[PDB]
RNA sequence: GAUGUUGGAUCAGGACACCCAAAUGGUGCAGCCGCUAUUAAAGGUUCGUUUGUUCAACGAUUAAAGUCCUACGUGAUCUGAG
């Protein structure tokens, strides 16, 4: 359950992810009709005074049994084309994400470790 | 909602409740019969039952000893629990306490009262409810049925 | 010398509710039907396990996981347990259903009992205690018939912690509280203690009749 | 909120003479075979429980005299005796309370 | 004449108290096992299956809930319903009930004779069964009729099907507005005084009355409800236990009413089921101890491997 | 010899001079968008930054984020920033 105004941590390696800022990156908007985002949902992130789109990878809220539950809320930076703006994603990603190939194809392609 | 709850709320809270039961239990183990409020007698019933089940666990068991410490306030009573009150219950599994309802109290309060008692105490016998004897027209009428069921077998 | 104590998998212990006992004989017959295919080994909270799952989405259908068993809960067929491990610096937990048909092989690498009956407090402990070697080999048991009790105090990150672990309702003997706390807070924590609870008698749960009955039920089920 | 009008005695007779506010007639009353006083079917006889209670009080007084102080209480079983009675062997080795009244008819020897 | 109150056990002695009980239970087992064979007794004419037909129902006991896994890897939770004692009781002809469908009255679990009414015990003495606790009326077409006093077992619903369930939901008593209806509250901290729950404005200034439907605090939950479109997964023959899908309204251990689904998608599904009802005597075969739907992972099995 | 007055909160009853959903006419309608007109009130009609603010601007969305009346609904239910 990741919602408006949640502080998220950017897992992929990107310009905007690693460089410091006086504000932790905040989630503005979740694109489900429910205000709650889950693994494999899509977010609008406010990072370093600009808006980027993201993909929720893992989160600290429990989920259906046998889903991996992560210590921190992890997002991958993403543009409108669905292309990950990052090169690769180190910290492990839910194997459930391979269910939808259509949207997440490239994101999956740059993913290192699955759990 | 109250669904599926086995405890009343009595006294100033949960602690007060435990201490109310403490007093009553001391009273019961000392005097072997007491007359108290029906809600509270009926509440005490369970604890009065299982306290005797620790008595059976033997004098040497530690978990029973620190239990007898909390629940029996007057210290003399503890040897009474182990050496007296426990041994005279042996064969009987659950048969310890008689609980019966008394006429309501005579004070302006008019509560609903019960007497609770250990079996085999030396006190005058409580005027228990009598069962109708067998010479009764109806019971005498059932004997025939019984003997006929014996005659058919 | 043969010390003999029978370890009954905790989910053969039926809950306190007023449920009709017929329900429990059913669950037992099903999970005992399940025992005969997939072999379920003993283990405790604190013991290290490695589970093999059937994964639809991966290429190698097997998914491997390894971690501590943090807690167990359930009854009947719905038995579960939780594994915890740090991969690359990410804390990861999984909730597994014991009797789930997707699970293929469960394997115990290290059989161990740590002081508390649940550790969720390894969430606020330092990253070492949650880290384990993915490739470590099974370290076997010497059949001492003593499950080794490892008493290990732990270090914790600065406060706040996901739960308040200092408080009496949790009864945590595992945490090292001298280094993580001050005397004031140790007096605070003592204001929430409810001393009379251990002496509550009636609050105690009686089993052994049921224990005999269902253990005899398991013998009877292995025989046939 | 203040009542808008005095109610008539008619309305009041309706409300407070309702069959629900009337005291119900208790049908479970019987007589006790011993003293022939009245008692309710599920409750002990009041008058019987009285003489039981009085005797318990007095026997507790005398067994308070047989005890020296507040905290001192017997480890033996107790057996109470009445005028003319001598202990059986089953009952010997136990604390004995001796009483003037000849043993009351409702209290048995056992 | 001031006549006293009497219960059944009042005047019996020590001797006669167990005797009465043993006697009543004896006559009960006797009367039950006697009705155990419907087909060889005086069976009513059996009619074929027409397409507009509607089957008899069942009365069950809700046991509890249990997890169950499909061959596909999905996890469902199911509710165990048990048939304890089920017999059809009386029969109402077409004209005598709805003008349309014939009423078949079905009885539930066995109770003790001692606490029921004179009229009711009379009804069961003219029948020959023990008294049933819960009695419900099923609507049924003329070709589905059975004969009064006939046993109904739990093989009646073959695995995979959709059933419907009616029962009294869990009673929560007199509940405020935030429960009963689910109105938001008032905010807690900003200086609100004594309002944190209350319904708020209940009507409009002009109307000067409050409308006949208006939602207010009151009785919540002891009422009849019905769950439709539940799938039946597996059946136990020996203990007579249905495993239905999802949840059934009522407390656990409550008495529950089961029928085939009246939903428009399933209308003709009744052509494959044993129709008057199921008859263990007639087929003269032993049904497997469990009847599983084709989807379900059985309690023993290969332990699924995807590929 | 008192019908306590702005905006919110809660709960909404109604109109149709439809903002969405549903059938259609005309087009300077090829299709995609559109722009107009007819018929249809069972159901919907978002979350924020600044203002006491309704209004308005602005960020982000939604199938849409209607126009109104009801003592500018609703203070013996609440809030008083005004
Ligand atoms: Mg800026
Ligand atoms: Mg209760
Ligand atoms: Mg009180
Ligand atoms: Mg009770
Ligand atoms: Mg928290
Ligand atoms: Mg209730
Ligand atoms: Mg609230
Ligand atoms: Mg308040
Ligand atoms: Mg005030
Ligand atoms: Mg006036
Ligand atoms: Mg409205
Ligand atoms: Mg119009
Ligand atoms: Mg409307
Ligand atoms: Mg106004
Ligand atoms: Mg106002
Ligand atoms: Mg008003
Ligand atoms: Zn009397």
CB pairs under 8 A between B and D: 62
Burial class (CB in 10 A: 0-12, 13-18, 19+), C149: exposed
Q: Beta strand E87-92 with E102-107: parallel, antiparallel or unpaired?
A: antiparallel
Burial class (CB in 10 A: 0-12, 13-18, 19+), B75: exposed
With beta carbons less than 8 A apart as the criterion, state whether E87 and E172 touch.
no
**Helix/strand/coil (H/E/C) assignment for every residue in E274-295:** CCCCCCHHHHCCCCCCEEECCC
Tokens standing for residue A60? 């600290």
Q: Beta strand E135-140 with A26-30: parallel, antiparallel or unpaired?
A: unpaired
Beta-carbon separation of C199 and B67 below 8 A: yes
Tokens standing for residue A41? 């949902």
Q: Which residues pair with E70 in a beta bridge?
A: E296
Exposure string over D25-39, b if 16+ CB within 10 A, otherwise e = eeeeeeebeeeeeeb
Beta-carbon separation of E13 and B146 below 8 A: no
Closest Cα of chain A to C57: distance in Å? Answer: 6
Burial class (CB in 10 A: 0-12, 13-18, 19+), B139: buried
Burial class (CB in 10 A: 0-12, 13-18, 19+), E189: exposed
- Taking the domain A1-115, which CATH number applies? 2.40.150.20
* Distance from CA(E171) to C1'(F13), angstroms, rounded: 31
Q: Which of A69, A68, A96, A86 is nearest to A11 (CA)?
A: A86
Q: Which of E219, E294, E249, E257 is nearest to E105 (CA)?
A: E257
Q: Which domains does chain B have, with CATH numbers?
A: 10-121 (3.90.1030.10)
Tokens standing for residue C72? 């167990």
End-to-end CA distance of chain A: give it in Å, rounded: 19
Write down the H helix ranges in E129-221. 177-180
Separation CA A73–CA A86 (nearest Å): 17
Distances (CA, A) of B96 to B77, B85, B116, C184: 18, 10, 10, 48
* Distance from CA(D31) to C1'(F70), angstroms, rounded: 71
Q: Do chains A and C touch (3 or more CB pairs under 8 A)?
A: yes
- Residue E57, C-beta contacts closer than 8 angstroms, at least 6 positions apart: E106, E136, E138, E257, E258, E259, E260
The alpha carbon torsion through C211, C216, C219, C221 (nearest 10 deg) reads: -100
CA of E191 to the centre of ligand 9 (A): 9
| Closest nucleotide to E206: CA versus each C1' | F70
Q: How was this structure determined?
A: cryo-EM
Residue C220: in which H helix or E strand, if any? helix C208-223
With beta carbons less than 8 A apart as the criterion, state whether A76 and A61 touch.
no
State the Rg of chain E over Cα: 25
Beta-carbon separation of B50 and C17 below 8 A: no
- CA dihedral (C176, C181, C182, C185) positive or negative: negative
Separation CA E154–CA C112 (nearest Å): 47
DSSP A7: B
Q: Which residues 32-51 of A interface with strand F at a CB distance below 7 A?
A: 33, 35, 44, 51
C184 touches chain B (CB under 8 A): no
Residue that is written with structure tokens 């509890």 in the block? E64
Neighbours of A31 (CB within 10 A): 10
Phi-psi sector, E52: left (phi>0), alpha (psi -120 to 50), beta: alpha
CA E129 to chain centre: 19
Distances (CA, A) of C121 to A62, C11, C89, C129, C153: 16, 23, 17, 11, 12
Beta-carbon separation of B134 and E16 below 8 A: yes
Separation CA E280–CA A39 (nearest Å): 52
* Distance from CA(A44) to C1'(F65), angstroms, rounded: 20
Domain ranges of chain A: 1-115
Distances (CA, A) of E201 to C112, E205, E214: 62, 10, 11
Residue in A72, A74, A99 nearest the CB of C57: A99
Tokens standing for residue E204? 């409009």
End-to-end CA distance of chain B: give it in Å, rounded: 55
CA A108 to chain centre: 12
With beta carbons less than 8 A apart as the criterion, state whether A44 and A54 touch.
yes
D42 touches chain E (CB under 8 A): no
CA of E204 to the centre of ligand 16 (A): 10
Closest Cα of chain C to A71: distance in Å? Answer: 5
Beta-carbon separation of E20 and B1 below 8 A: no
Tokens standing for residue C117? 């009956």
Separation CA C82–CA C98 (nearest Å): 10
At how many Å resolution was this determined? 3.4
Exposure string over C35-52, b if 16+ CB within 10 A, otherwise e = beebeeeebbbbbbbbbb
- Residue C69, C-beta contacts closer than 8 angstroms, at least 6 positions apart: C43, C44, C45, C46, C47, C48, C49, C81, C82, C83
With beta carbons less than 8 A apart as the criterion, state whether B21 and B43 touch.
yes
Residue B15: in which H helix or E strand, if any? helix B14-31
* Distance from CA(B23) to C1'(F18), angstroms, rounded: 76
* Distance from CA(C124) to C1'(F26), angstroms, rounded: 72
Distances (CA, A) of B81 to A38, D8, D71: 61, 68, 15
- Residue E180, C-beta contacts closer than 8 angstroms, at least 6 positions apart: E215, E217, E218, E220
| φ/ψ of residue B117, rounded to 5 | -150, 145
Residue that is written with structure tokens 């949960």 in the block? B14
Is the Cβ atom of E197 within 7 Å of strand F at any atom?
no
Distances (CA, A) of E4 to C92, D6, E7, E136: 73, 44, 10, 34
Q: Which of E120, E84, E91, E127 is nearest to E255 (CA)?
A: E84
- Residue A4, C-beta contacts closer than 8 angstroms, at least 6 positions apart: A27, A28, A29, A30, A35
**Beta strands, E only, chain C:** 48-54, 62-73, 80-87, 90-97, 103-110, 113-114, 149-150
- Residue E56, C-beta contacts closer than 8 angstroms, at least 6 positions apart: E88, E104, E106, E138, E140, E144, E146, E152, E156, E276, E277
With beta carbons less than 8 A apart as the criterion, state whether E175 and E217 touch.
yes
With beta carbons less than 8 A apart as the criterion, state whether E22 and B148 touch.
no
| φ/ψ of residue E105, rounded to 5 | -95, 120
B102 touches chain D (CB under 8 A): yes
| φ/ψ of residue B64, rounded to 5 | -80, -30
State the Rg of chain D over Cα: 27
Separation CA E198–CA E185 (nearest Å): 7
Beta-carbon separation of D28 and E2 below 8 A: no
Separation CA E87–CA E147 (nearest Å): 10
| Binding residue positions of D for Zn(2+) | 32, 35, 45, 48
The CA-based angle D86-D90-D91, given to 5 degrees, is: 50
Separation CA E83–CA E256 (nearest Å): 10
The CA-based angle D54-D55-D60, given to 5 degrees, is: 100
Neighbours of E178 (CB within 10 A): 15
The DSSP line for B17-63 is HHHHHHHHHHHHHHHSEEEEEHHHHHHHHHHHHHHHHHHTT-SS-HH
Q: Which of B36, B34, B43, B35 is nearest to B10 (CA)?
A: B43
Closest Cα of chain E to D87: distance in Å? Answer: 33
Q: Is the peptide bond before C160 cis (omega within 30 degrees of 0)?
A: yes
CA atoms within 13 A on the CB side of B44: 30
Closest Cα of chain D to E3: distance in Å? Answer: 8
Strand, helix or coil at B70? helix
The DSSP line for D50-85 is HHHHHHHHHHHHHHHHSS-SSS---SS-EEEE-TT-
With beta carbons less than 8 A apart as the criterion, state whether B40 and B20 touch.
yes
DSSP B124: P
Q: Which residues pair with E175 in a beta bridge?
A: E218
Closest-CA residue of chain C to E304? C102
CA E197 to chain centre: 37
Q: Which residues 207-246 of E interface with strand F at a CB distance below 7 A?
A: 207, 211, 215
Domain ranges of chain D: 27-110
Tokens standing for residue E306? 């995807």
Separation CA C94–CA C83 (nearest Å): 5
Q: Which of B115, B121, B119 is nearest to B100 (CA)?
A: B115
Beta-carbon separation of D43 and B130 below 8 A: no
Separation CA E109–CA E149 (nearest Å): 14
DSSP 3-state helix, strand, coil percentages of chain C (rounded to 5)? 30, 25, 45
The length of chain B in residues reads 153
- Residue D82, C-beta contacts closer than 8 angstroms, at least 6 positions apart: D99, D100, D101, D102, D103
Residue B95: in which H helix or E strand, if any? none
Q: Which residues pair with C83 in a beta bridge?
A: C69, C94
Q: Which of A59, E74, A64 is nearest to C56 (CA)?
A: E74
Residue D21: in which H helix or E strand, if any? none
């Amino acid at each position: 359950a990741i919602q408006k105004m949640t502080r998220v941590r950017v897992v992929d390696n990107s310009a905007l992810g690693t460089t410091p800022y006086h504000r932790p990156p905040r989630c503005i908007h979740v694109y489900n009709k429910t205000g709650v985002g889950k693994v494999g949902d899509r977010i609008l992130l406010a990072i370093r005074g600009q808006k980027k789109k993201a993909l929720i990878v893992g989160h600290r809220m429990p989920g259906p049994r046998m889903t991996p539950r992560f210590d921190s809320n992890n997002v991958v930076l993403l543009e409108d084309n669905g292309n990950p703006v990052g090169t690769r994603i180190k910290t492990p990603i839910p194997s459930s994400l391979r269910q939808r190939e259509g949207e997440f194809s490239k994101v999956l392609a740059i993913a290192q470790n699955f759990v | 909602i109250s669904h599926g709850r086995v405890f009343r709320r009595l006294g100033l809270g949960p602690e007060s409740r435990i201490h109310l039961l403490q007093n009553l239990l001391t009273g019961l183990v000392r005097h072997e019969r007491i007359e108290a409020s029906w809600a509270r007698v009926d509440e005490l019933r369970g604890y009065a039952e299982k306290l005797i089940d620790y008595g059976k666990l033997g004098d040497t068991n530690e978990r029973a000893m620190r239990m007898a410490d909390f629940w029996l306030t007057e210290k003399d009573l503890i040897p009474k629990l182990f050496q007296v009150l426990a041994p005279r219950f042996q064969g009987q599994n659950g048969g310890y306490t008689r609980m019966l309802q008394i006429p309501n109290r005579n004070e302006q309060d008019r509560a609903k009262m019960a007497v609770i008692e250990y079996k085999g105490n030396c006190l005058p016998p409580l005027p228990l409810p009598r069962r109708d004897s067998n010479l009764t027209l109806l019971n005498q009428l059932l004997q025939g049925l019984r003997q006929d069921q014996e005659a058919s077998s | 010398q043969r010390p003999e104590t029978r370890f009954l998998s905790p989910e053969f212990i039926p809950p306190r509710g007023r449920t009709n006992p017929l329900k429990f004989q059913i669950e037992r017959k099903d999970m005992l039907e399940r025992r005969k295919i997939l072999h379920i080994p003993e283990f405790y909270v604190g013991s290290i396990l490695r589970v093999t799952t059937a994964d639809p989405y991966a290429s190698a259908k097997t998914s491997q996981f390894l971690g501590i068993c943090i807690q167990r809960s359930g009854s009947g067929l719905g038995a579960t347990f939780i594994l915890r491990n740090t991969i690359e610096g990410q804390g990861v937990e999984i909730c597994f259903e014991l009797y789930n048909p997707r699970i293929q092989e469960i394997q115990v690498v290290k059989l161990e009992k740590r002081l508390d009956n649940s550790l969720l407090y390894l969430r606020d402990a330092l990253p070492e205690y949650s880290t384990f070697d993915v490739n470590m080999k099974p370290i076997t048991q010497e059949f001492n018939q003593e499950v080794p009790v490892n008493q290990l105090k732990v270090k914790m990150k600065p406060k706040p912690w996901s739960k308040r672990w200092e408080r009496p309702k949790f009864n945590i003997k595992g945490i090292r509280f001298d280094l993580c706390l001050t005397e004031e807070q140790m007096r605070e924590a003592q204001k929430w203690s409810q001393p009379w609870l251990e002496f509550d008698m009636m609050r105690e749960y009686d089993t052994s009749k049921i224990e005999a009955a269902i253990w005899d039920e398991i013998e009877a089920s292995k025989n046939s | 909120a203040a009542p808008k009008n005095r109610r008539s005695i008619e309305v009041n007779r309706c409300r407070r003479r309702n069959p629900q506010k009337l005291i119900k007639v208790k049908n479970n009353i019987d007589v006790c075979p011993e003293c022939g006083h009245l008692k309710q079917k599920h409750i002990l006889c009041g008058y019987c429980y009285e003489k039981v209670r009085k005797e318990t009080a007095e026997i507790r007084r005398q067994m308070g005299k047989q005890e020296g102080g507040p905290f001192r209480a017997p480890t033996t079983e107790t057996v109470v005796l009445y005028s003319g009675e001598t202990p059986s062997e089953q009952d010997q080795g136990k604390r004995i309370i001796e009483r003037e009244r000849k043993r009351p008819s409702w209290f048995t020897q056992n | 004449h001031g006549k006293s109150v009497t219960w059944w056990d009042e005047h019996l002695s020590e001797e006669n108290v167990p005797f009465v009980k043993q006697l009543v239970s004896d006559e009960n087992k006797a009367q039950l096992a006697s009705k155990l064979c419907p087909l060889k007794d005086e069976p009513w004419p059996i009619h074929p299956w027409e397409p507009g037909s509607s089957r008899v129902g069942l009365i069950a006991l809700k046991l509890g809930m249990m997890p169950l896994w499909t061959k596909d890897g999905q996890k469902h939770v199911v509710t165990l319903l048990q048939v304890q004692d089920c017999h059809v009781l009386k029969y109402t002809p077409k004209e005598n009930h709805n003008g349309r469908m014939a009423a078949l009255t079905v009885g539930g679990k066995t109770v003790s004779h001692f606490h029921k009414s004179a009229s009711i015990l009379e009804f069961y003495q003219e029948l020959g069964l023990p008294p049933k606790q819960k009695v419900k009326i099923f609507n049924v077409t003329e070709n589905a009729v059975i004969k009064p006093g006939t046993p109904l077992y739990a093989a009646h619903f073959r695995p995979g099907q959709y059933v419907d369930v009616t029962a009294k939901t869990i009673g929560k008593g007199f509940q405020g507005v935030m429960r009963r209806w689910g109105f938001k509250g008032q905010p807690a901290t900003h200086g609100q005084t004594k309002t944190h729950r209350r319904p708020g404005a209940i009507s409009t200034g002009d109307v000067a009355r409050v409308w006949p439907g208006t939602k207010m605090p009151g009785q919540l939950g002891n009422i009849d409800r019905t769950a439709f479109g539940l799938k039946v997964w597996r059946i136990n023959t020996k203990h007579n236990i249905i495993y239905v899908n999802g949840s059934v309204p009522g407390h656990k251990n409550c008495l529950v009413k089961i029928k085939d689904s009246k939903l428009p998608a399933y209308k003709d599904f009744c052509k494959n089921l044993p129709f008057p009802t199921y008859f263990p005597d007639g087929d003269e075969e032993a049904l497997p101890e469990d009847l599983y739907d084709e989807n379900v992972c059985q309690p023993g099995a290969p332990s699924i491997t995807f590929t």
